[PDB]
Symmetry: C4
Subunit: 82 residues, 4 copies
């Protein structure tokens, strides 16, 4: 898969996660973006996490759609940086 | 391995983890399902975790059986989504 | 690498991590074993973590030696289970 | 890629993360180094995390640049240790 397509795919995941956390959990856009990276990179500090049923459901979807997408994106980035 | 078989395998892991956490740690079904995804995707927020010896033992088994299963499942999903 | 050798290697990492956390951080053997799995599987709930300089140094070594070892072990286990 | 080059690359990431967290979040050098490993290995205990907007932005960059770099480094280390 072309590196640029992978880039678009991860950006789409980042938008999905950021907007979802912002509207569902009520955190700021900045905190939501940060939480999205922390989540799809599977770093998960837990400083932020969903506290509502809908948030938990949403997070599971982001986990399933974002973790794999992020993994592929980073490796491809490694090539263009190495 | 057929994608559908991998799907069944991860669903089985999700059931095992959710039921185990629910009965051993006493959290709701929804919270238990959420914790199971957070755990097998190795996101681990820590908002929920085992507080009993049996829970800790159980979690280690879920980690060993679920993390690898989840990893294979996500990649296969990437193919059908990309 | 033979699956059995990989098994021995991960068991050695588990012993190293469990004994180290127990003696350095002072947690029980059970909690230490649990923390070791949570750490080498890179789940990291944070319910337990090092609170001393030596503990932090030790944890970094466990991270470097255990995460890769655990990853290889799980995949090999996937074969014998799938 | 030569193992030694990968080594230099991960060391560079470790310096970037440690210095950044120290100056941006104000934690000690030791705690910052520890947090950097915990973050790039994607262990993420959450005992330490950024509490400022700049820190969050910085952490996202470290996540993108360090997680992949660390992954490649550990595998290469596995070869020289196994
Ligand atoms: K992880
Ligand atoms: K991981
Ligand atoms: K974590
Ligand atoms: K993690
Ligand atoms: K955590």
């Amino acid at each position: 898969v072309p590196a640029t397509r992978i880039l678009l795919l991860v950006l789409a995941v980042i938008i999905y996660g950021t907007a979802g956390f912002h509207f569902i959990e009520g955190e700021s856009w900045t905190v939501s973006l940060y939480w999205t990276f922390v989540t799809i990179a599977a770093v998960g500090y837990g400083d932020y996490s969903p506290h509502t049923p809908l948030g938990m459901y949403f997070t599971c979807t982001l986990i399933v759609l974002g973790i794999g997408t992020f993994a592929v994106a980073v490796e491809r980035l490694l090539e263009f940086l190495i």
